[PDB]
């Protein structure tokens, strides 16, 4: 038998850590990325600024929030700026109380007060180490949401329509934007045809608007960021609208640049701090909200072209905000004859690409609580508002976690012949039961949610095999072993029901035995008063050493 | 190596099942119980009817709801009638919109419409098999609630006070009601001094109100149940008050008679159906709400005197409702000189007994999320209303379940010397690591909540022991084994991150191996397209057969 043993300019500003080893060979590589990601910020930061209902606010949002993150950030391949989902939800939740055609100085004061409050929601969630709650946003919630929101904005934008040289132009240069996605989904080296097809859609349609001169978006104001917080309306009537939009774009614009600092960390093996990562983007917003920026966070699309044309570190986040230092000042009069429809298919390719219909139905034949969540975020945004299509699909994604912790699986086990290892009897048809014993595996953690369910379930198996004992004249159950290998945690109410089970099973001379615990259980089983009534003679190394010791 | 194998008058009316074997020796025993439980329904059904703010409504509620449950119920020692907690919450949530001294025909129409809607909430939660959600009500939530509600009713009842023969009488006959609880908490055979001290408080103080004749409660209306639903106001202004009271007393009056049909089932080994058990009490109410009954469910106190004076089955639930058939008709003129204070210490003993201060602080030194839940139900009922003292303490009791599924414990393991069993290295200081391997145990289920956390945590241990490999010139990690013994479940998003981990670990020649799965994982690992990329050469019987097979 074996004994069950029991067990400041570099903290705040992390550019100084990795900045002391930047080479020229790296600087050969973090410029051809940031020539192309500052070729996808110029037609897809003015395009999803249109989707939020002015087009230069998406370019102010590609200069200072990339520069702030390069000082405070903890990834090196996360590339920043605006995104596509947060802009659409910004453009829907604000269109249905104000209108940018009617109150354009009060539509600019609401995509700023939301951004500042999408700044403190992302900063002071990661400052108080509370950034695990961005993981509750499942992949099936966001398939339902992004796709149940890409219809009710397709109605609100098609109420603003109610020409032959426009609609025959905006489908052919959408075809340079969807066939370059058909051919970039096949080969993961043909990103380069899609890495500038947002730019060669604009530039080739610039000259056809320059030789056929005259609904163009025109002369945009040359200059730096306007110093806002003179357009931050903290004290007014539209604050709840600019707080609900800043909560709702403070989660949709967090789970895209938290979950891209994780999917580009395991590829390259650098630990991204998560909560210190969340502190950065909440200073990308609330300290960028005063500089004509709206809600920014790292993109899913303009990161997988940063690490597809070989980025090496986060100075390609400065080649972002230094080759945008150029274009806000010099090529703005070239933008005077750049049309509106050419950047509206750039919205459209991030609408049809938002309705992932295959993944919307693939999760029907493999699960049916990650399918109810899709069709509760689908019909929760179509029928109820945007805030309740997310609240009831997170809420039934959190339910299938609770529906397995309540009512878990308790198997009956038995020794697999030829070895001293006790597996279940649902699997392993050949597994034999020991006559004087009963092995029962609790396959979840023992909480208040299921402490009273194990007692009513162990004594169903124990009742099952005291009436089956008389059928073959066998020895009945004289030791029930709890294979606690699968029990992850135990609380005070789960540890109590293990002591109210021992003294019920003592009154039938059954001798309940725990076997094979884990860490954070044995330090609760040997440091509480509900544990020294178990002690060392009922907590074993494995089942095979509990059967061998034979507690009787 | 071993192969990982993969796997109508008796349905509705259950008195006919156990009714065919009732003996006279049982009928000797289910009458001395039901002489005493119909001696605790008469002074504690009129007493907690006062706590809900007429005293005969608690006696109508001890005749027909015990009779309906004896037909539809699935326990035999659960004894029914009103309770103490649901009455207090009924008397608080209705006092703060109407007043029974001012609108007594509209206070009787609101402790009925609530009961009917505490009838369909308990019936049509167990009819749709949804009765696991009564387990979310933790024992620490109810310590905070019952005790954070027994103050704000102690203020509302002490606004109705603002004599020498009353207050000198109501403390001495509270002392016959608290010292009989001091002596019944010590010896669990001295229930009999407390089994009639609620009745010998009333009957001995009857004659001292009969020789000192004259705030007495007096002549109560003799007769059967009045046939209500002429006092059910489905269509009015006070329906939301009588729906919030029927939701809130449809959970507090469910977790007392679900959780007593479970704690009196494991003692006696009879399987109580739970959802069919929940169907009964929701017909004890919504089909009893038309017969002058308020919200009834099995008691914690009048069940542990039913099974302390030897009950045998649920005809002691008819000796309840046939020895109450007597007393509603014959001893009612004896009740004419029965005082009000004698049944108000019967309220008081279920107030000081509600403030379990020891258990309110015992869960501080053993846990601190089952202590935050007490002091969020404490200050959630004192400051916010009754419905939010429960909503925010269930909500942070459900949080510690989610705070362990998000961010679980991943241990590093290693072979315990002398045996082929791989335990962790937090416990078992003597445990040795195999040189060419790395064993990592995932101690929770793999959900969307934590699929991206294992990848960022396995590659912290893998990074930990490739820099520690060069310190002692050892062989580095060439096989990472996932001891999946503790992984209870896996979803579609947790199974995907195990395939996005295999092909990252393939690109370093590391060969991720799952080992020792459970049921409801191997039927997902061998019946999905994310499983045949694993197959049979990466899903092993145990770790000791994965180390022995050596996948390289």
PDB file of N, CA, C and O in Angstrom, chain A residues 360-424:
ATOM      1  N   UNK A 360     -23.792  26.353 -38.661  1.00  0.00           N
ATOM      2  CA  UNK A 360     -25.051  26.562 -37.959  1.00  0.00           C
ATOM      3  C   UNK A 360     -25.855  25.278 -37.861  1.00  0.00           C
ATOM      4  O   UNK A 360     -26.661  25.124 -36.938  1.00  0.00           O
ATOM      5  N   UNK A 361     -25.651  24.347 -38.797  1.00  0.00           N
ATOM      6  CA  UNK A 361     -26.365  23.079 -38.810  1.00  0.00           C
ATOM      7  C   UNK A 361     -25.485  21.875 -38.512  1.00  0.00           C
ATOM      8  O   UNK A 361     -26.023  20.802 -38.222  1.00  0.00           O
ATOM      9  N   UNK A 362     -24.157  22.017 -38.592  1.00  0.00           N
ATOM     10  CA  UNK A 362     -23.256  20.930 -38.216  1.00  0.00           C
ATOM     11  C   UNK A 362     -23.386  20.599 -36.739  1.00  0.00           C
ATOM     12  O   UNK A 362     -23.307  19.430 -36.350  1.00  0.00           O
ATOM     13  N   UNK A 363     -23.657  21.602 -35.917  1.00  0.00           N
ATOM     14  CA  UNK A 363     -23.856  21.418 -34.491  1.00  0.00           C
ATOM     15  C   UNK A 363     -25.256  20.972 -34.149  1.00  0.00           C
ATOM     16  O   UNK A 363     -25.680  21.207 -33.018  1.00  0.00           O
ATOM     17  N   UNK A 364     -25.997  20.394 -35.098  1.00  0.00           N
ATOM     18  CA  UNK A 364     -27.272  19.741 -34.830  1.00  0.00           C
ATOM     19  C   UNK A 364     -27.118  18.228 -34.720  1.00  0.00           C
ATOM     20  O   UNK A 364     -27.721  17.604 -33.840  1.00  0.00           O
ATOM     21  N   UNK A 365     -26.301  17.629 -35.586  1.00  0.00           N
ATOM     22  CA  UNK A 365     -26.088  16.191 -35.584  1.00  0.00           C
ATOM     23  C   UNK A 365     -25.009  15.739 -34.611  1.00  0.00           C
ATOM     24  O   UNK A 365     -24.746  14.535 -34.526  1.00  0.00           O
ATOM     25  N   UNK A 366     -24.360  16.658 -33.893  1.00  0.00           N
ATOM     26  CA  UNK A 366     -23.306  16.288 -32.954  1.00  0.00           C
ATOM     27  C   UNK A 366     -23.679  16.742 -31.547  1.00  0.00           C
ATOM     28  O   UNK A 366     -23.174  16.201 -30.559  1.00  0.00           O
ATOM     29  N   UNK A 367     -24.575  17.721 -31.447  1.00  0.00           N
ATOM     30  CA  UNK A 367     -25.057  18.212 -30.165  1.00  0.00           C
ATOM     31  C   UNK A 367     -26.426  18.834 -30.378  1.00  0.00           C
ATOM     32  O   UNK A 367     -26.813  19.154 -31.499  1.00  0.00           O
ATOM     33  N   UNK A 368     -27.178  18.972 -29.290  1.00  0.00           N
ATOM     34  CA  UNK A 368     -28.499  19.582 -29.375  1.00  0.00           C
ATOM     35  C   UNK A 368     -28.752  20.549 -28.232  1.00  0.00           C
ATOM     36  O   UNK A 368     -29.902  20.946 -28.021  1.00  0.00           O
ATOM     37  N   UNK A 369     -27.722  20.917 -27.475  1.00  0.00           N
ATOM     38  CA  UNK A 369     -27.738  22.107 -26.647  1.00  0.00           C
ATOM     39  C   UNK A 369     -26.793  23.184 -27.154  1.00  0.00           C
ATOM     40  O   UNK A 369     -26.921  24.340 -26.747  1.00  0.00           O
ATOM     41  N   UNK A 370     -25.856  22.830 -28.026  1.00  0.00           N
ATOM     42  CA  UNK A 370     -25.152  23.780 -28.870  1.00  0.00           C
ATOM     43  C   UNK A 370     -25.850  23.972 -30.207  1.00  0.00           C
ATOM     44  O   UNK A 370     -25.261  24.547 -31.125  1.00  0.00           O
ATOM     45  N   UNK A 371     -27.070  23.460 -30.348  1.00  0.00           N
ATOM     46  CA  UNK A 371     -27.964  23.820 -31.438  1.00  0.00           C
ATOM     47  C   UNK A 371     -29.132  24.658 -30.971  1.00  0.00           C
ATOM     48  O   UNK A 371     -29.599  25.515 -31.716  1.00  0.00           O
ATOM     49  N   UNK A 372     -29.617  24.416 -29.757  1.00  0.00           N
ATOM     50  CA  UNK A 372     -30.616  25.296 -29.172  1.00  0.00           C
ATOM     51  C   UNK A 372     -30.048  26.683 -28.924  1.00  0.00           C
ATOM     52  O   UNK A 372     -30.783  27.671 -28.995  1.00  0.00           O
ATOM     53  N   UNK A 373     -28.744  26.783 -28.659  1.00  0.00           N
ATOM     54  CA  UNK A 373     -28.129  28.079 -28.423  1.00  0.00           C
ATOM     55  C   UNK A 373     -27.994  28.885 -29.696  1.00  0.00           C
ATOM     56  O   UNK A 373     -28.076  30.114 -29.646  1.00  0.00           O
ATOM     57  N   UNK A 374     -27.776  28.220 -30.830  1.00  0.00           N
ATOM     58  CA  UNK A 374     -27.773  28.919 -32.110  1.00  0.00           C
ATOM     59  C   UNK A 374     -29.151  29.483 -32.421  1.00  0.00           C
ATOM     60  O   UNK A 374     -29.282  30.659 -32.776  1.00  0.00           O
ATOM     61  N   UNK A 375     -30.190  28.672 -32.260  1.00  0.00           N
ATOM     62  CA  UNK A 375     -31.554  29.076 -32.560  1.00  0.00           C
ATOM     63  C   UNK A 375     -32.255  29.724 -31.377  1.00  0.00           C
ATOM     64  O   UNK A 375     -33.475  29.884 -31.416  1.00  0.00           O
ATOM     65  N   UNK A 376     -31.528  30.073 -30.318  1.00  0.00           N
ATOM     66  CA  UNK A 376     -32.006  31.065 -29.368  1.00  0.00           C
ATOM     67  C   UNK A 376     -31.301  32.399 -29.514  1.00  0.00           C
ATOM     68  O   UNK A 376     -31.852  33.419 -29.098  1.00  0.00           O
ATOM     69  N   UNK A 377     -30.094  32.413 -30.077  1.00  0.00           N
ATOM     70  CA  UNK A 377     -29.503  33.655 -30.534  1.00  0.00           C
ATOM     71  C   UNK A 377     -29.990  34.036 -31.915  1.00  0.00           C
ATOM     72  O   UNK A 377     -29.884  35.202 -32.287  1.00  0.00           O
ATOM     73  N   UNK A 378     -30.491  33.084 -32.695  1.00  0.00           N
ATOM     74  CA  UNK A 378     -31.075  33.432 -33.982  1.00  0.00           C
ATOM     75  C   UNK A 378     -32.361  34.204 -33.779  1.00  0.00           C
ATOM     76  O   UNK A 378     -32.476  35.369 -34.169  1.00  0.00           O
ATOM     77  N   UNK A 379     -33.330  33.576 -33.137  1.00  0.00           N
ATOM     78  CA  UNK A 379     -34.634  34.155 -32.891  1.00  0.00           C
ATOM     79  C   UNK A 379     -34.671  35.005 -31.643  1.00  0.00           C
ATOM     80  O   UNK A 379     -35.753  35.398 -31.208  1.00  0.00           O
ATOM     81  N   UNK A 380     -33.523  35.293 -31.047  1.00  0.00           N
ATOM     82  CA  UNK A 380     -33.473  36.203 -29.927  1.00  0.00           C
ATOM     83  C   UNK A 380     -33.057  37.583 -30.378  1.00  0.00           C
ATOM     84  O   UNK A 380     -33.300  38.571 -29.685  1.00  0.00           O
ATOM     85  N   UNK A 381     -32.405  37.652 -31.533  1.00  0.00           N
ATOM     86  CA  UNK A 381     -32.063  38.932 -32.135  1.00  0.00           C
ATOM     87  C   UNK A 381     -33.108  39.334 -33.175  1.00  0.00           C
ATOM     88  O   UNK A 381     -33.406  40.524 -33.326  1.00  0.00           O
ATOM     89  N   UNK A 382     -33.704  38.362 -33.867  1.00  0.00           N
ATOM     90  CA  UNK A 382     -34.754  38.664 -34.835  1.00  0.00           C
ATOM     91  C   UNK A 382     -36.024  39.174 -34.170  1.00  0.00           C
ATOM     92  O   UNK A 382     -36.686  40.066 -34.708  1.00  0.00           O
ATOM     93  N   UNK A 383     -36.379  38.637 -33.011  1.00  0.00           N
ATOM     94  CA  UNK A 383     -37.651  38.969 -32.389  1.00  0.00           C
ATOM     95  C   UNK A 383     -37.476  39.920 -31.216  1.00  0.00           C
ATOM     96  O   UNK A 383     -38.058  41.007 -31.213  1.00  0.00           O
ATOM     97  N   UNK A 384     -36.692  39.538 -30.218  1.00  0.00           N
ATOM     98  CA  UNK A 384     -36.345  40.414 -29.108  1.00  0.00           C
ATOM     99  C   UNK A 384     -35.136  41.229 -29.572  1.00  0.00           C
ATOM    100  O   UNK A 384     -34.602  40.982 -30.659  1.00  0.00           O
ATOM    101  N   UNK A 385     -34.710  42.219 -28.788  1.00  0.00           N
ATOM    102  CA  UNK A 385     -33.581  43.080 -29.132  1.00  0.00           C
ATOM    103  C   UNK A 385     -32.236  42.363 -29.162  1.00  0.00           C
ATOM    104  O   UNK A 385     -32.158  41.148 -28.980  1.00  0.00           O
ATOM    105  N   UNK A 386     -31.168  43.120 -29.411  1.00  0.00           N
ATOM    106  CA  UNK A 386     -29.832  42.542 -29.535  1.00  0.00           C
ATOM    107  C   UNK A 386     -29.324  42.039 -28.188  1.00  0.00           C
ATOM    108  O   UNK A 386     -28.664  40.997 -28.112  1.00  0.00           O
ATOM    109  N   UNK A 387     -29.666  42.730 -27.101  1.00  0.00           N
ATOM    110  CA  UNK A 387     -29.144  42.370 -25.790  1.00  0.00           C
ATOM    111  C   UNK A 387     -29.743  41.088 -25.239  1.00  0.00           C
ATOM    112  O   UNK A 387     -29.149  40.488 -24.342  1.00  0.00           O
ATOM    113  N   UNK A 388     -30.904  40.666 -25.728  1.00  0.00           N
ATOM    114  CA  UNK A 388     -31.531  39.442 -25.253  1.00  0.00           C
ATOM    115  C   UNK A 388     -31.337  38.273 -26.204  1.00  0.00           C
ATOM    116  O   UNK A 388     -31.782  37.169 -25.897  1.00  0.00           O
ATOM    117  N   UNK A 389     -30.703  38.483 -27.343  1.00  0.00           N
ATOM    118  CA  UNK A 389     -30.360  37.367 -28.190  1.00  0.00           C
ATOM    119  C   UNK A 389     -29.050  36.787 -27.724  1.00  0.00           C
ATOM    120  O   UNK A 389     -28.738  35.623 -27.971  1.00  0.00           O
ATOM    121  N   UNK A 390     -28.273  37.611 -27.040  1.00  0.00           N
ATOM    122  CA  UNK A 390     -27.055  37.159 -26.399  1.00  0.00           C
ATOM    123  C   UNK A 390     -27.295  36.659 -24.986  1.00  0.00           C
ATOM    124  O   UNK A 390     -26.651  35.691 -24.576  1.00  0.00           O
ATOM    125  N   UNK A 391     -28.203  37.279 -24.245  1.00  0.00           N
ATOM    126  CA  UNK A 391     -28.441  36.898 -22.865  1.00  0.00           C
ATOM    127  C   UNK A 391     -29.077  35.528 -22.727  1.00  0.00           C
ATOM    128  O   UNK A 391     -28.820  34.841 -21.735  1.00  0.00           O
ATOM    129  N   UNK A 392     -29.892  35.104 -23.697  1.00  0.00           N
ATOM    130  CA  UNK A 392     -30.573  33.818 -23.605  1.00  0.00           C
ATOM    131  C   UNK A 392     -29.841  32.719 -24.343  1.00  0.00           C
ATOM    132  O   UNK A 392     -30.252  31.559 -24.266  1.00  0.00           O
ATOM    133  N   UNK A 393     -28.768  33.039 -25.056  1.00  0.00           N
ATOM    134  CA  UNK A 393     -27.950  32.008 -25.669  1.00  0.00           C
ATOM    135  C   UNK A 393     -26.667  31.741 -24.915  1.00  0.00           C
ATOM    136  O   UNK A 393     -26.154  30.629 -24.976  1.00  0.00           O
ATOM    137  N   UNK A 394     -26.130  32.743 -24.223  1.00  0.00           N
ATOM    138  CA  UNK A 394     -25.152  32.469 -23.178  1.00  0.00           C
ATOM    139  C   UNK A 394     -25.818  31.701 -22.047  1.00  0.00           C
ATOM    140  O   UNK A 394     -25.252  30.744 -21.505  1.00  0.00           O
ATOM    141  N   UNK A 395     -27.059  32.066 -21.719  1.00  0.00           N
ATOM    142  CA  UNK A 395     -27.765  31.493 -20.589  1.00  0.00           C
ATOM    143  C   UNK A 395     -28.161  30.043 -20.755  1.00  0.00           C
ATOM    144  O   UNK A 395     -28.358  29.353 -19.753  1.00  0.00           O
ATOM    145  N   UNK A 396     -28.295  29.564 -21.989  1.00  0.00           N
ATOM    146  CA  UNK A 396     -28.497  28.142 -22.233  1.00  0.00           C
ATOM    147  C   UNK A 396     -27.250  27.472 -22.756  1.00  0.00           C
ATOM    148  O   UNK A 396     -27.275  26.268 -23.037  1.00  0.00           O
ATOM    149  N   UNK A 397     -26.160  28.217 -22.913  1.00  0.00           N
ATOM    150  CA  UNK A 397     -24.838  27.622 -23.019  1.00  0.00           C
ATOM    151  C   UNK A 397     -24.263  27.366 -21.641  1.00  0.00           C
ATOM    152  O   UNK A 397     -23.632  26.337 -21.414  1.00  0.00           O
ATOM    153  N   UNK A 398     -24.510  28.271 -20.699  1.00  0.00           N
ATOM    154  CA  UNK A 398     -24.192  28.001 -19.309  1.00  0.00           C
ATOM    155  C   UNK A 398     -25.102  26.957 -18.693  1.00  0.00           C
ATOM    156  O   UNK A 398     -24.796  26.467 -17.606  1.00  0.00           O
ATOM    157  N   UNK A 399     -26.213  26.616 -19.345  1.00  0.00           N
ATOM    158  CA  UNK A 399     -27.129  25.641 -18.771  1.00  0.00           C
ATOM    159  C   UNK A 399     -26.648  24.219 -18.994  1.00  0.00           C
ATOM    160  O   UNK A 399     -26.778  23.384 -18.096  1.00  0.00           O
ATOM    161  N   UNK A 400     -26.081  23.919 -20.164  1.00  0.00           N
ATOM    162  CA  UNK A 400     -25.584  22.571 -20.412  1.00  0.00           C
ATOM    163  C   UNK A 400     -24.345  22.251 -19.595  1.00  0.00           C
ATOM    164  O   UNK A 400     -24.023  21.073 -19.419  1.00  0.00           O
ATOM    165  N   UNK A 401     -23.638  23.268 -19.102  1.00  0.00           N
ATOM    166  CA  UNK A 401     -22.616  23.038 -18.092  1.00  0.00           C
ATOM    167  C   UNK A 401     -23.267  22.678 -16.768  1.00  0.00           C
ATOM    168  O   UNK A 401     -22.827  21.757 -16.076  1.00  0.00           O
ATOM    169  N   UNK A 402     -24.350  23.364 -16.412  1.00  0.00           N
ATOM    170  CA  UNK A 402     -25.028  23.067 -15.160  1.00  0.00           C
ATOM    171  C   UNK A 402     -25.881  21.810 -15.250  1.00  0.00           C
ATOM    172  O   UNK A 402     -26.064  21.127 -14.242  1.00  0.00           O
ATOM    173  N   UNK A 403     -26.395  21.478 -16.435  1.00  0.00           N
ATOM    174  CA  UNK A 403     -27.152  20.246 -16.636  1.00  0.00           C
ATOM    175  C   UNK A 403     -26.259  19.010 -16.685  1.00  0.00           C
ATOM    176  O   UNK A 403     -26.769  17.888 -16.683  1.00  0.00           O
ATOM    177  N   UNK A 404     -24.943  19.168 -16.704  1.00  0.00           N
ATOM    178  CA  UNK A 404     -24.069  18.033 -16.474  1.00  0.00           C
ATOM    179  C   UNK A 404     -23.501  18.000 -15.070  1.00  0.00           C
ATOM    180  O   UNK A 404     -23.136  16.928 -14.590  1.00  0.00           O
ATOM    181  N   UNK A 405     -23.407  19.141 -14.398  1.00  0.00           N
ATOM    182  CA  UNK A 405     -22.989  19.102 -13.006  1.00  0.00           C
ATOM    183  C   UNK A 405     -24.150  18.687 -12.118  1.00  0.00           C
ATOM    184  O   UNK A 405     -23.997  17.811 -11.268  1.00  0.00           O
ATOM    185  N   UNK A 406     -25.332  19.271 -12.292  1.00  0.00           N
ATOM    186  CA  UNK A 406     -26.522  18.562 -11.848  1.00  0.00           C
ATOM    187  C   UNK A 406     -26.716  17.363 -12.744  1.00  0.00           C
ATOM    188  O   UNK A 406     -26.469  17.442 -13.946  1.00  0.00           O
ATOM    189  N   UNK A 407     -27.175  16.269 -12.161  1.00  0.00           N
ATOM    190  CA  UNK A 407     -27.369  14.979 -12.812  1.00  0.00           C
ATOM    191  C   UNK A 407     -26.159  14.511 -13.611  1.00  0.00           C
ATOM    192  O   UNK A 407     -26.236  14.459 -14.843  1.00  0.00           O
ATOM    193  N   UNK A 408     -25.024  14.179 -12.986  1.00  0.00           N
ATOM    194  CA  UNK A 408     -23.918  13.637 -13.772  1.00  0.00           C
ATOM    195  C   UNK A 408     -24.093  12.164 -14.069  1.00  0.00           C
ATOM    196  O   UNK A 408     -25.127  11.574 -13.752  1.00  0.00           O
ATOM    197  N   UNK A 409     -23.090  11.561 -14.685  1.00  0.00           N
ATOM    198  CA  UNK A 409     -23.085  10.132 -14.947  1.00  0.00           C
ATOM    199  C   UNK A 409     -22.339   9.423 -13.836  1.00  0.00           C
ATOM    200  O   UNK A 409     -21.203   9.777 -13.524  1.00  0.00           O
ATOM    201  N   UNK A 410     -22.979   8.435 -13.240  1.00  0.00           N
ATOM    202  CA  UNK A 410     -22.337   7.548 -12.283  1.00  0.00           C
ATOM    203  C   UNK A 410     -22.353   6.157 -12.883  1.00  0.00           C
ATOM    204  O   UNK A 410     -23.423   5.595 -13.123  1.00  0.00           O
ATOM    205  N   UNK A 411     -21.182   5.625 -13.166  1.00  0.00           N
ATOM    206  CA  UNK A 411     -21.081   4.338 -13.799  1.00  0.00           C
ATOM    207  C   UNK A 411     -20.887   3.305 -12.708  1.00  0.00           C
ATOM    208  O   UNK A 411     -20.542   3.625 -11.570  1.00  0.00           O
ATOM    209  N   UNK A 412     -21.151   2.059 -13.046  1.00  0.00           N
ATOM    210  CA  UNK A 412     -20.732   0.929 -12.235  1.00  0.00           C
ATOM    211  C   UNK A 412     -19.504   0.361 -12.917  1.00  0.00           C
ATOM    212  O   UNK A 412     -19.417   0.361 -14.147  1.00  0.00           O
ATOM    213  N   UNK A 413     -18.515  -0.024 -12.134  1.00  0.00           N
ATOM    214  CA  UNK A 413     -17.248  -0.465 -12.675  1.00  0.00           C
ATOM    215  C   UNK A 413     -17.003  -1.908 -12.289  1.00  0.00           C
ATOM    216  O   UNK A 413     -17.818  -2.551 -11.634  1.00  0.00           O
ATOM    217  N   UNK A 414     -15.849  -2.407 -12.697  1.00  0.00           N
ATOM    218  CA  UNK A 414     -15.470  -3.769 -12.415  1.00  0.00           C
ATOM    219  C   UNK A 414     -14.133  -4.062 -13.044  1.00  0.00           C
ATOM    220  O   UNK A 414     -13.747  -3.384 -13.997  1.00  0.00           O
ATOM    221  N   UNK A 415     -13.419  -5.060 -12.524  1.00  0.00           N
ATOM    222  CA  UNK A 415     -12.032  -5.277 -12.916  1.00  0.00           C
ATOM    223  C   UNK A 415     -11.965  -5.841 -14.327  1.00  0.00           C
ATOM    224  O   UNK A 415     -12.675  -6.791 -14.675  1.00  0.00           O
ATOM    225  N   UNK A 416     -11.168  -5.202 -15.172  1.00  0.00           N
ATOM    226  CA  UNK A 416     -10.944  -5.695 -16.524  1.00  0.00           C
ATOM    227  C   UNK A 416      -9.986  -6.868 -16.390  1.00  0.00           C
ATOM    228  O   UNK A 416      -8.925  -6.714 -15.769  1.00  0.00           O
ATOM    229  N   UNK A 417     -10.320  -8.050 -16.919  1.00  0.00           N
ATOM    230  CA  UNK A 417      -9.534  -9.248 -16.605  1.00  0.00           C
ATOM    231  C   UNK A 417      -8.159  -9.220 -17.251  1.00  0.00           C
ATOM    232  O   UNK A 417      -7.997  -8.822 -18.406  1.00  0.00           O
ATOM    233  N   UNK A 418      -7.164  -9.633 -16.473  1.00  0.00           N
ATOM    234  CA  UNK A 418      -5.781  -9.575 -16.887  1.00  0.00           C
ATOM    235  C   UNK A 418      -5.007  -8.398 -16.345  1.00  0.00           C
ATOM    236  O   UNK A 418      -3.802  -8.305 -16.602  1.00  0.00           O
ATOM    237  N   UNK A 419      -5.655  -7.504 -15.601  1.00  0.00           N
ATOM    238  CA  UNK A 419      -5.002  -6.315 -15.075  1.00  0.00           C
ATOM    239  C   UNK A 419      -5.778  -5.827 -13.863  1.00  0.00           C
ATOM    240  O   UNK A 419      -6.945  -6.167 -13.676  1.00  0.00           O
ATOM    241  N   UNK A 420      -5.098  -5.058 -13.023  1.00  0.00           N
ATOM    242  CA  UNK A 420      -5.703  -4.496 -11.815  1.00  0.00           C
ATOM    243  C   UNK A 420      -6.149  -3.055 -12.050  1.00  0.00           C
ATOM    244  O   UNK A 420      -5.730  -2.129 -11.369  1.00  0.00           O
ATOM    245  N   UNK A 421      -7.017  -2.874 -13.036  1.00  0.00           N
ATOM    246  CA  UNK A 421      -7.540  -1.556 -13.358  1.00  0.00           C
ATOM    247  C   UNK A 421      -9.036  -1.675 -13.575  1.00  0.00           C
ATOM    248  O   UNK A 421      -9.487  -2.523 -14.347  1.00  0.00           O
ATOM    249  N   UNK A 422      -9.793  -0.814 -12.916  1.00  0.00           N
ATOM    250  CA  UNK A 422     -11.234  -0.968 -12.782  1.00  0.00           C
ATOM    251  C   UNK A 422     -11.907   0.043 -13.692  1.00  0.00           C
ATOM    252  O   UNK A 422     -11.944   1.234 -13.381  1.00  0.00           O
ATOM    253  N   UNK A 423     -12.434  -0.431 -14.816  1.00  0.00           N
ATOM    254  CA  UNK A 423     -13.174   0.397 -15.751  1.00  0.00           C
ATOM    255  C   UNK A 423     -14.645   0.038 -15.688  1.00  0.00           C
ATOM    256  O   UNK A 423     -15.037  -0.923 -15.032  1.00  0.00           O
ATOM    257  N   UNK A 424     -15.452   0.798 -16.419  1.00  0.00           N
ATOM    258  CA  UNK A 424     -16.901   0.739 -16.290  1.00  0.00           C
ATOM    259  C   UNK A 424     -17.482  -0.473 -17.013  1.00  0.00           C
ATOM    260  O   UNK A 424     -16.775  -1.287 -17.610  1.00  0.00           O
TER     261      UNK A 424
END
